[PDB]
Design a protein around this motif. Structure first.
Motif, mmCIF file in Angstrom:
data_model
loop_
_atom_site.group_PDB
_atom_site.id
_atom_site.type_symbol
_atom_site.label_atom_id
_atom_site.label_comp_id
_atom_site.label_asym_id
_atom_site.label_seq_id
_atom_site.Cartn_x
_atom_site.Cartn_y
_atom_site.Cartn_z
ATOM 1 N N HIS A 43 7.211 2.102 32.872
ATOM 2 C CA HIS A 43 8.113 1.270 33.595
ATOM 3 C C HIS A 43 7.187 0.510 34.509
ATOM 4 O O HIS A 43 6.534 1.123 35.380
ATOM 5 N N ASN A 45 6.953 -2.417 37.102
ATOM 6 C CA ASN A 45 7.885 -3.019 38.033
ATOM 7 C C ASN A 45 7.244 -3.786 39.273
ATOM 8 O O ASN A 45 7.108 -3.208 40.342
ATOM 9 N N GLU A 51 12.908 -2.071 47.342
ATOM 10 C CA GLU A 51 12.666 -0.674 47.763
ATOM 11 C C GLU A 51 11.603 -0.563 48.842
ATOM 12 O O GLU A 51 10.874 0.385 48.834
ATOM 13 N N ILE A 58 4.845 -1.376 41.058
ATOM 14 C CA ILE A 58 5.103 0.081 40.988
ATOM 15 C C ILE A 58 5.176 0.378 39.506
ATOM 16 O O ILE A 58 5.855 -0.348 38.783
ATOM 17 N N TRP A 67 12.565 10.130 36.175
ATOM 18 C CA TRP A 67 11.338 9.487 36.659
ATOM 19 C C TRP A 67 10.164 10.486 36.860
ATOM 20 O O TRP A 67 10.324 11.584 37.415
ATOM 21 N N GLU A 70 5.206 7.993 40.684
ATOM 22 C CA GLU A 70 4.867 6.576 40.722
ATOM 23 C C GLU A 70 3.384 6.322 40.889
ATOM 24 O O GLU A 70 2.711 7.079 41.593
ATOM 25 N N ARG A 72 1.135 3.085 42.293
ATOM 26 C CA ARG A 72 1.252 1.843 43.028
ATOM 27 C C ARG A 72 -0.053 0.999 42.909
ATOM 28 O O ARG A 72 -1.174 1.479 43.189
HETATM 29 O O1 LIG Z 1 9.760 5.072 40.359
HETATM 30 C C1 LIG Z 1 10.345 3.952 39.723
HETATM 31 C C2 LIG Z 1 11.767 3.673 40.156
HETATM 32 O O2 LIG Z 1 11.684 3.530 41.580
HETATM 33 C C3 LIG Z 1 12.986 3.446 42.123
HETATM 34 O O3 LIG Z 1 12.899 3.315 43.571
HETATM 35 C C4 LIG Z 1 12.274 4.417 44.124
HETATM 36 C C5 LIG Z 1 11.211 3.821 45.073
HETATM 37 O O4 LIG Z 1 10.081 3.251 44.400
HETATM 38 C C6 LIG Z 1 10.644 4.804 46.050
HETATM 39 O O5 LIG Z 1 10.019 4.146 47.132
HETATM 40 C C7 LIG Z 1 11.483 6.020 46.374
HETATM 41 O O6 LIG Z 1 11.367 6.457 47.704
HETATM 42 O O7 LIG Z 1 12.741 6.171 45.748
HETATM 43 C C8 LIG Z 1 13.317 5.270 44.847
HETATM 44 C C9 LIG Z 1 14.099 6.124 43.903
HETATM 45 O O8 LIG Z 1 15.043 6.813 44.719
HETATM 46 C C10 LIG Z 1 13.801 2.298 41.543
HETATM 47 O O9 LIG Z 1 15.141 2.382 42.010
HETATM 48 C C11 LIG Z 1 13.864 2.302 40.017
HETATM 49 O O10 LIG Z 1 14.539 1.139 39.570
HETATM 50 C C12 LIG Z 1 12.440 2.474 39.472
HETATM 51 O O11 LIG Z 1 11.673 1.289 39.725
#
Ligand SMILES: OC[C@H]1O[C@@H](O[C@H]2[C@H](O)[C@@H](O)[C@@H](O)O[C@@H]2CO)[C@H](O)[C@@H](O)[C@H]1O
Ligand SMILES: OC[C@H]1O[C@@H](O[C@H]2[C@H](O)[C@@H](O)[C@@H](O)O[C@@H]2CO)[C@H](O)[C@@H](O)[C@H]1O
Lengths: 132, 132
Positions: A43, A45, A51, A58, A67, A70, A72
Motif C-alpha cells: 500500500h 500512500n 492523517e 507512507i 495492516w 508502516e 515512512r
Molecule cells: O498504515 C496505512 C494506513 O494508515 C491509515 O492511517 C493510519 C495512520 O498512518 C497512522 O498515523 C495511525 O496513527 O493510524 C491510522 C490508522 O488508524 C490510513 O487510514 C489507511 O488508509 C492506510 O493508509
C-alpha cells in the motif's frame, strides 16, 4: 472507490509502471499491489495532508485485511494537479519502488507470494499502466 | 479467466489503447469493454481458428448476459506469437476500433451508457493500457 485491475501477472524480476494524474486538491492518493482486495504486498500512500502527515510517503502491507507495520519515506517528488509515474519492481523478498525523479526505495515482502495479480488505486486518475 | 479492470472512466471523445502479446498457439483472443462483467458495449474477438471462423474479427454486444447480433470483419492484421495494439474510441452512438495497420471500423452502441468503466480480456497477455 478507485479502480481495480485483477488477474494480470507481475512475476519476479519485472516491474509494473503506473502513470496517473493527481487532482489539484488531493490530500493523498494510494496505489495497492498484491493478491486481492484483502492482501496488499504494498500500500503505497503519498500524503500531501492526511492523517497528520505532510509530504510523506507512507507504505504498509495488508494481510487478510490487517495492516502491517508502516514504513515512512521523506522522499516526495509529487505535486497536486500534475501527472506522476511510479515503477514497482518485484524481487524475491522486496519491492523496489522507483520514482520519476530517480529516487528509489525498497519495501519488504512480508507474505507468501508467487505472482502479483492485483492492483487498486484511489485518489489518482489513471493515465497508463504497463508491464516490463 | 482473463484479466479485468474496473472503475476507470472512459468518456465520450476519448480512446483506450490496449497493447498485448498474442500466444503463438492462440485460437482466438477477446477484449471486452462496457459497464460490468454482464454488460459489454463491445466484445472484440479476433479468431485465428475458432467457432469455424479463420482470420475474422467477430464483434458483438452483451446486455444483461445476452449476446446481441454479431458483426463480422474480414480485416485481420494479427499474428500469433506477436504483439498487437488496438484503440477503442468512444463516440455518442458507436465505438470506433482502430487497428495497428491503420484499418478502422465502427461498432454500434446498443445500450444505455454514460461512461465506459469496465474492461476484460482473455487469450492475450497484457503489455500496456492507456487512456487518451
Ligand atoms: O498504515 C496505512 C494506513 O494508515 C491509515 O492511517 C493510519 C495512520 O498512518 C497512522 O498515523 C495511525 O496513527 O493510524 C491510522 C490508522 O488508524 C490510513 O487510514 C489507511 O488508509 C492506510 O493508509
Ligand atoms: O457472438 C459472440 C460470441 O460468439 C460465440 O460463438 C458463437 C459463434 O460466433 C457463432 O458462429 C454461433 O453460431 O454461435 C456461437 C454461440 O453459440 C462465442 O462462443 C462467444 O465466446 C462469443 O465470442
Amino acid at each position: 472507490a478507485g479502480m481495480v485491475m485483477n488477474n494480470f501477472s507481475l512475476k519476479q524480476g519485472h516491474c509494473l509502471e503506473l502513470k496517473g494524474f493527481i487532482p489539484k486538491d488531493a490530500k493523498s492518493f494510494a496505489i495497492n499491489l498484491g493478491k486481492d482486495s484483502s492482501n496488499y504486498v504494498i500500500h503505497f500512500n503519498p500524503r500531501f495532508d492526511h492523517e497528520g502527515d505532510t509530504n510523506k510517503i507512507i507504505c504498509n502491507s495488508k494481510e487478510e485485511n490487517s495492516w502491517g507495520t508502516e514504513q515512512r519515506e521523506n522522499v516526495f517528488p509529487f505535486q497536486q494537479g500534475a501527472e506522476t509515474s511510479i515503477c514497482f519492481e518485484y524481487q524475491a523478498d522486496h519491492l523496489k519502488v522507483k520514482l520519476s525523479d530517480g529516487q528509489e526505495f525498497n519495501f519488504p515482502i512480508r507474505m507468501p507470494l508467487d505472482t502479483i495479480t492485483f492492483l487498486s488505486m484511489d485518489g489518482i486518475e489513471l493515465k497508463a499502466i504497463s508491464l516490463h
